[PDB]
Amino acid sequence: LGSFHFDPYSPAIDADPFPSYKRLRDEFPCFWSEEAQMWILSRYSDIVTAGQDWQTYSSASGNLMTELPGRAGATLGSSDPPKHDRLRGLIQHAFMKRNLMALEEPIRDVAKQVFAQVKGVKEFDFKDVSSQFTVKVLMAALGLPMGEDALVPEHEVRENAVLMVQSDARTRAKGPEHIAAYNWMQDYASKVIAMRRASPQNDLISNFALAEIDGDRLDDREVLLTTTTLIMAGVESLGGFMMMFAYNLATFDEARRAVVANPALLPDAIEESLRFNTSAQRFRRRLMKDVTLHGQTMKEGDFVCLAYGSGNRDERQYPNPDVYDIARKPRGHLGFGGGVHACLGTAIARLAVKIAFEEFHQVVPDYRRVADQLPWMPSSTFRSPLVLQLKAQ
Ligand code: HEM
């Protein structure tokens, strides 16, 4: 009794990691967690340094806190340069050719359709609308055919996208149904990719197949794995963050009233929510050499947790860090990571959340949490409520 532990597999850390993060930063800034069997970095400046130093802190053994089964050499998140940079350059080229900000209309169309479903409703769970919106945004961006009339109906894609990002609550690892959903999605994406190769369209999948930089192109394994890992990354992170932003606005009346009255404040409020509580809380790296930090002798081959959610609450970087201040305009926050793996979806996410809440707030201009104590999702990497029950006010 009394000994300090940090267990990212613990439901206590799902629900409220922040007091433990503060003890890490203040008392144990390079902490060995016996439950995670890895070191924990918690201070903003240490996380920035480690995230930038990919030669020391490798992603090639996986970047999720709990492990990913497949082909890391074709993924961005679980690869190191130079391969990572070749892939990222080609994908960013495809993003440029499509023009991500021209997704304004399909995203706003989705938002109007989804959030109309809570018009006039006394009480609802934001998880439903936010998951629907999230998957529809990824489908519209990639070019996965939408509508229940589509050959593969939309709700079936959503069901498999939502399941494939989940993990077993007990072990926080993937189970057979999660791997089956991933393989279903790989097969589904493969059929769309073939169709877009035959007849390119104004979507991201088509631009993945067409992108070339001085004779280089993404190979067959690479267009597929790019499509599927963008679905995976987007659904897990954007869906969780949609919930975090609504949770904050429901909790902090003055912030909610301000952005509803002046929706031009939404981008700043979104950045303060990314700082205050990103959905993408904790990622891992593997040491490529021995590193001594704060008196601790980390060893080659050890794993390390970059607790982005802790660095963003570090008073050494952000004064009064536990204050939710939508006027803060935080710069350099870690809500999207940092370095060569900084979120590839940053611009899409910022646009999508902005448009979603523009339209949501026209349907429901005032709302609060129903609950004091909320249930939180079991994840060693991500954080969001399982249920975000809101009441119209
Ligand atoms: C609010 C929404 C989102 C948040 C908070 C978020 C957060 C993050 C974070 C923290 C990382 C870095 C992980 C690491 O350091 O290992 C990351 C990487 C990544 N994200 Fe996001 N993400 C969001 C939305 C998206 C979306 C919508 C997409 C796709 C459309 C996406 C695709 C990716 C990819 C592909 C990577 C890996 C990039 C690389 O390794 O070079 N994310 N995200």
Author numbering: 3 to 395
How do the authors describe this structure?
Here, we show that the natural α-diazoester azaserine can be produced by Streptomyces albus engineered with a previously uncharacterized biosynthetic gene cluster and act as the carbene precursor for coupling with intracellularly produced styrene to generate unnatural amino acids containing a cyclopropyl group, which has wide applications in organic synthesis and occurs frequently in medicine development, by a reaction catalyzed by an evolved cytochrome P450 mutant with its native cofactor. To incorporate an abiological carbene transfer reaction into biosynthesis, an appropriately engineered enzyme capable of using azaserine as the carbene precursor was required.
In the initial screening, E. coli cells expressing the wild-type (WT) P450-T2 and a CYP119 mutant exhibited both significant activity and different diastereoselectivity compared to the control expressing the red fluorescence protein (RFP). Although the diastereoselectivity (dr, the percentage of the major diastereomer versus the sum of all diastereomers in the product) from the reaction catalyzed by whole cells containing P450-T2 was 87.8%, it was 99.3% when the reaction was catalyzed by purified protein. This site corresponds to the T268 residue in P450 BM3, a site that has been reported to be important for increasing the activity of P450 BM3 toward carbene transfer reactions. The third-round mutant (S239V, F338H) was about 5 times more active than the S239V mutant. The F338 position corresponds to F393 in P450 BM3, whose mutation was reported to change the reduction potential of the heme and to affect its catalytic behavior. After 5 rounds of evolution, the fifth-round mutant (P450-T2–5) catalyzed the reaction with high diastereoselectivity (dr >99%) and moderate yield (42.7%); this yield is 251 times higher than that from the reaction catalyzed by WT enzyme. Aside from catalyzing cyclopropanation of styrene with azaserine, P450-T2 WT and P450-T2–5 also catalyzed the insertion of the carbene unit from azaserine into the sp3 C–H bond of phthalan.
